[PDB]
Curated annotation (Swiss-Prot), chain A:
Substrate binds at residue 395. Changing residue 113 to K: Loss of reductoisomerase activity. GO terms for molecular function: 2-dehydropantoate 2-reductase activity; identical protein binding; ketol-acid reductoisomerase activity; magnesium ion binding; NADP binding. Pathway: Amino-acid biosynthesis; L-isoleucine biosynthesis; L-isoleucine from 2-oxobutanoate: step 2/4; Amino-acid biosynthesis; L-valine biosynthesis; L-valine from pyruvate: step 2/4. Mg(2+) 1 binds at residues 198, 202. Changing residue 63 to S: 7- and 2.5-fold increase of the reductoisomerase activity with NADH and NADPH, respectively. Induction: In the presence of acetohydroxybutyrate and acetolactate and by the activator IlvY. This is Ketol-acid reductoisomerase (NADP(+)). Belongs to the ketol-acid reductoisomerase family. InterPro entries: 6-PGluconate_DH-like_C_sf, 6PGD_dom2, KARI, KARI_C, KARI_N, NAD(P)-bd_dom_sf. SUPFAM superfamilies: 6-phosphogluconate dehydrogenase C-terminal domain-like, NAD(P)-binding Rossmann-fold domains. It is found in: Cytoplasm.
Curated annotation (Swiss-Prot), chain C:
Binds 2 magnesium ions per subunit. The gene is ilvC. This is Ketol-acid reductoisomerase (NADP(+)). GO terms for molecular function: 2-dehydropantoate 2-reductase activity; identical protein binding; ketol-acid reductoisomerase activity; magnesium ion binding; NADP binding. Pfam families: KARI_C, KARI_N.
């Protein structure tokens, strides 16, 4: 909607904003927010307090009728310098359409995600400064990391249309610092870049790939013997185990945890998935860009979330979701060795998401964070309570997206599955000799990928930031 | 229209295609086209010229014209016959053609293609020099016809002059994806290109969309639009401030050529280096102020070009008997500069630089801005470089030959309309800017002297550090080697 | 000694001369160049006799050589290590193919060739046609087909001698013995242990040939790779002073002098070591009848792999630290290692020491009889999986794996290697 | 002596040590010395500077003077005490002292330590500011004594001046391997360097050998030797060609400083950039000719510095009562340039450039040739830079203050000897070159005007593509960051 009012050059200009900000740029912290009253509409407030800010949660009237000054809207919004609205996507219009009137002049509005501004096309009072601070973590590891004296990497942005006194960045950086983001790393992006990539990631590989992949591997393991109790155990904690290597060294390291002959097959499966799934990944990115996605989901918002719930149904009534969990323990290496197709699905999904985004004007640095960086964290979720936990930790917009994709992906891959060879999923592939040349050329192609190169450079930064704990 | 039926991802894909090909990729020269019947439609300048080259290259070239042209002893008809070419009618040469090269003016493209297709056999190839008919008009070519493009990077006849010197002009080639049934696009495309001599100087593998958008932006912005605007703005200023008209017109007519020659040898960096330190810094300053003022107008043109608002607009004029094109042509021809007498005496090379500080700045400003705007619209640097700097020295040569009149005559009608569309906007835009020119900006040299070391250092780096200077150095290198192989 | 008459600057000059020529510098080809009876009527002479009887040859060949004639070498040892003088009218050049055996011919017949080095002596190029002859000569051997390096007599000798007596042969011999005796000593049937060693090096270096150390290490399981890495380091740490000693004596000429002395002592040391070495268990051991899977040689040769990595790096490093060019060091501390491994698989150490020059052999022994003793305490503390058995394939520390992988492919020689191999791979594509 | 005891490999090892350290590598600063006895043997300009610096840094500093020097309150006594510095004798200070900084002239170095060691406790450290003692003389220090070094990259007293400004001077620290028992060398050296504020500009982790060998080369060539030979040669030339002696004396006295300042801001690149194009072209050509002629001489110097031929020869003179050093000093002071009257009128900044074409070229030739010759001898580009360009501006400031007299009086005797050693050979060497200068090379400006585009482009690249220019921009970039930290 708002994105669609821009032209190619203007969309591209915004679509490609994402710079890793230096440590010299945060030589102030939450300074610009010192003294000023900050009204949130926990994760962050708790952290910001320890930074020296005046946090105050403004709960709903009905809620505040049945350690911060938990007051209300009119009882806080007026003298508020920065209203950090963190309500669900489906209700931003209302919240913002009731909070603005109460907001004083020269105040700033705070967003966590840019769906309202960009997709819904919300109109904010020309004197209100609109900004955004979104930490890279599906859960609450932001507050946790804050305790360890460190923090999670975060993205900041300031809507051009609403930068009255030109103090958007000052507030943004201040807010980010208060959350500890400057400790890990802050990405100077934009509302448009954040929304398109975010939607792409979550529905295509961060959650979309993991749901379809879980319901495809489990179901397959069962069709091929395998004790469902044991199966479900592999699928539930697998993603997490292989993705932990992914977190430590990218796709490169993840592939190296396999035996050379295993790896090669994994690479082979990887390339085949990308061949099959490419069109779907594209369709998803294209619909996000054209605004066809947002438009469609919103139709469900006004239709009682029918689709969003109907899919909740089937999801909860799936073999995997409703299956016994093996009691015995499974070795770490066992999840790799037995999860060749899973590793292959990760590589293909990560690479395809990355590539599709970059082909749509999104900068690599940005695409990296939305197609690989958070993949681990979301995996940890399933490794706690199957898909259920995932579709609970993530927003409804994410879940809606995941279903939209996964319920299309699964069928698409039915034939492919019906062709798996022994060793692909379930039984391990024995280490052995392999063509020296093929091993060399394949190992190179992997670490040579655009996401492995930037992922390295980016992981290298976020590391030097953790070095500084003095 | 066609571009408009594409989504963000698809447009970007096309917009970004531009690879400098390897000399070895043309090992078969024009062989693929050997023994084939090549029919050229429209014997204009580029038409006749490409014909001569392709003939000298051993190809089978014959010109096809509307029966009326041949009947009326029209000029196109005489040009062909007087040049020992086989000239016939559409129904007489098209039916057995393997390659129909449409080199008629853009306005006529749709009509030409509408009568030539029916006569074209199955599997035959249709060639263009500009992708306007395909991208902007949306022309639908029969499914079995292969559509390709070969666009020599030169405004006039240098493509022939260079070929006679055993060399050539750098060229762009493309093959429309929707029309490559036998997958022989590139084969035909490379053959034709080599036939014109393009492989000797360098050939770029781009796309129809990338060629149309970048090419339109360049001509209506820095390649022609800026030169006209600048010539008029600068000449007038020169006279207003006292300079003798006859001497002022000489300064402008040959000024561009002299300073762009330096640009040719070494990009913006060298052009600026010809100036004295204090003069350089001022030029730098002026160009930055100029880029601030013109950025919106530059952007409007690029935006309108990307959105089809420009083609749509010009097509409106096509159907209006070229009213806007012709009225602007006539007006531009009545300008003081176009009629001003030319200085009798002589002007030294360095005088054009010293007395043309603003002209140098306009070139720098226009070049970077056009390049920048294009790259910001999804066009790849290589393309942007060729359409916002490479051909500038060539257009300047045209002006040094016969004022603006020559430029507008040499360039296509689409380029002429595009130029005017920008010119009649850019001149007013700069009125206030010109009103504040300081002494030395234009007309008089800035006394040589000391300059702050830090500033000269910072300005020298700002110059050669620019994206266009980087790419330029590289791309000029390639072309210099291809030319280097003149043995 | 010539090299010794030069000063630090003049030495670093020669020592650092080595440029990988291009496809273009070989357009003419052998076109330029197209007993006492032939000696006089000769355009160019090609002395390929052993280093010991080199001075003599020239001392009888010069007199017969016409004026403006050219003299060619294959090892500047006689020019650099031996203060050999030649007529100022004689143009001295060199063309030495980077291959020990005879693949210099086997490859030519196939169409390709062996990457060869060429150089011209400073004070011996009056007509200034050194390169003309060298390029034409080398071209006639098929060198331009694989790649020819433009180095110098000094750069050639100094690095050539360090390579053969260190990683190319010295490490191979000492490694074989140390490893064979250790296997047997730990139980392993001597007939089996014998095949492992004889053919192990060849199998291992094959990967090394295709993708340098990186690929060699990649053939091992992660846990085995990590162990091979550690063993590699420990190893370099210990052999360090020895490689340095060898490189240093080759620079100072303490080596060339020591061996030229044994030339007067009727190759005493050279033959005492040639014999003593044949009495070794490995040289005189029964060969397993059964078979050993390609992958077994890797999984059961961890310490063997470590010796190669360590040896190649340390040799490469020590050469660069003495003023030798990277690419120059690559072709003398890794490129030829595979070719020599083949020799050992063909006929144990006997074959190797027989193929390599007498100088090469002498050097090998000088290192072996020193290295072997040095590693005894090391070997004594080995662990299961390190040699003979196979470290079971399992999980490893993501971080440690990742760091080691990068540590391995980040080494200088691995960088140059990937590049140089690429060059040669494309020089071969041109056919 | 010592350096000669090492072999090719071993030499190159030490010879190639010199890496720029990270800002945070000095988090502790000089806290490793806070609470220890810091004694400084011998007091002079250099000494007092550092002491006063480490003083404010917070370190117990004392000055151990000779027996007589305390009885008749000599210069050293005065300078120290007057500043409120704790003074004493060797017998009452050296013992129970953690760090004994030997800041005395090289000529007396051996003897100084040959009396200080015995009194030094166990585990005590012996610092330096030049390794001529260690490297050039077989000075044997107690196996238990740690030998470190901290030599600031400034000939004058800016090490103290810049410290008072809250900044510092890039310093080069090192540690003799043969004397690092408790392996605390780097810990101390690092602290010492921080105590002089050196970490505020940039601290280079090098070695005793790299320092000596490079430090000596630069001073006797480009850094000083060239400046003296250049001054004399040009002054005599300017006068011989008709420039008023008083004006010529001023052109030379203040030219090196002016030209060299631009050098300080942007390396050879910016320096050349201050000249007019035709002038830049000529300076460039003169630079090449000058390097071809002086190559053997620069080489000889570097070579003798390595072979020990230099240190050997100078030490000989030490015993001969400094015969040569004094004779040359006397001769120099009688040169026309040193006694000539200084023009009273003002000379514009740009004039020093324009009329100093040859001076600029001499700096280019000398700088590159020195750098080139050092690198060709195993010295790292990083180390070659600081000793063949970084300090040139500072030495030029000296001459501008009091002709060559001041230069020679500021630099050490070893430096002065090296200078004369080179000068009195360079001057006769360039006599025939000077006889061939063309109009404009010296004393008169070369009028701006046209120049071949390609040529100017080429020269421009050649200039900024030189090795020293590369490392230069890199290093100067680092030092500028440490500088930009004015927070």
């Amino acid at each position: 909607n708002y994105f669609n009012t821009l032209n190619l050059r203007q969309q591209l200009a915004q679509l490609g904003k994402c710079r890793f900000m230096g440590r010299d740029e945060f030589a102030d912290g939450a300074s610009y927010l010192q003294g000023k009253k900050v009204v949130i509409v926990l994760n962050q407030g708790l952290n910001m307090r320890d930074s020296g800010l005046d946090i105050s949660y403004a709960l709903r009237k009905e809620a505040i009728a049945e350690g911060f000054k938990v007051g209300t809207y009119e009882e806080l919004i007026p003298q508020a310098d920065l209203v950090i609205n963190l309500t669900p996507d489906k209700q931003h219009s209302d919240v913002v359409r009731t909070v603005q009137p109460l907001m004083k002049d020269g105040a700033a509005l705070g967003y966590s995600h840019g769906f309202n501004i960009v997709e819904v096309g919300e109109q904010i009072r020309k004197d209100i400064t609109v900004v955004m601070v979104a930490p890279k973590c599906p859960g609450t590891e932001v507050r946790e990391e804050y305790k360890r004296g460190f923090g999670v990497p975060t993205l900041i942005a300031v809507h051009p249309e609403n930068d009255p006194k030109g103090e958007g960045m000052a507030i943004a950086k201040a807010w980010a610092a208060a959350t500890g983001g400057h400790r890990a790393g802050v990405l100077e992006s934009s509302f448009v870049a954040e929304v398109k990539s975010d939607l792409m990631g979550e529905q295509t590989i961060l959650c979309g790939m993991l749901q379809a992949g879980s319901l495809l591997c489990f179901d397959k393991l069962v069709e091929e013997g395998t004790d469902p109790a044991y199966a479900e155990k592999l699928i539930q904690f697998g993603w997490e185990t292989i993705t932990e290597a992914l977190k430590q060294g990218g796709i490169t390291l993840m592939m190296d945890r396999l035996s050379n002959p295993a790896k090669l097959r994994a690479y082979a499966l990887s390339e085949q998935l990308k061949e099959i799934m490419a069109p779907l990944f594209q369709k998803h990115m294209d619909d996000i860009i054209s605004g066809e996605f947002s438009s469609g989901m919103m139709a469900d918002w006004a239709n009682d979330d029918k689709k969003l719930l109907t899919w909740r149904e089937e999801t909860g009534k799936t073999a995997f979701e409703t299956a016994p969990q093996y009691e015995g323990k499974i070795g770490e290496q066992e999840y790799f060795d037995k999860g060749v197709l899973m590793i292959a699905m990760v590589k293909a999904g990560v690479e395809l998401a990355f590539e599709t985004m970059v082909d749509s004007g999104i900068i690599e640095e940005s695409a990296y964070y939305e197609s690989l960086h958070e993949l681990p964290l979301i995996a940890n979720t399933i490794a706690r309570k199957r898909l259920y936990e995932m579709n609970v930790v993530i927003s409804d917009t994410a879940e809606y997206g995941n279903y939209l994709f996964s319920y299309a992906c699964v069928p698409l891959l039915k034939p492919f599955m019906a062709e798996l060879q022994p060793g692909d999923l379930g039984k391990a592939i024995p280490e052995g000799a392999v063509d020296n040349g093929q091993l060399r050329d394949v190992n190179e192609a992997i670490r040579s990928h655009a996401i492995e190169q930037v992922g390295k450079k980016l992981r290298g930064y976020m590391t030097d930031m953790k070095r500084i704990a003095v």
